[PDB]
Amino acid sequence: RWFYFNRITGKRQFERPKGLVKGWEKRWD
Known part of the structure; x- marks a missing residue:
């Protein structure tokens, strides 16, 4: 996931951005 x-x-987590913000990067596990 x-x-x-x-x-x-x-x-960072497996959930929605730890704040639903910018800076956040969707990467592979």
Whole structure:
């Protein structure tokens, strides 16, 4: 499954962006 990484805060999960923001990057697991 795909995940999301926020380069601004450095947070990421398997859920929706850890904030539904920008900076977030959808990558492969």
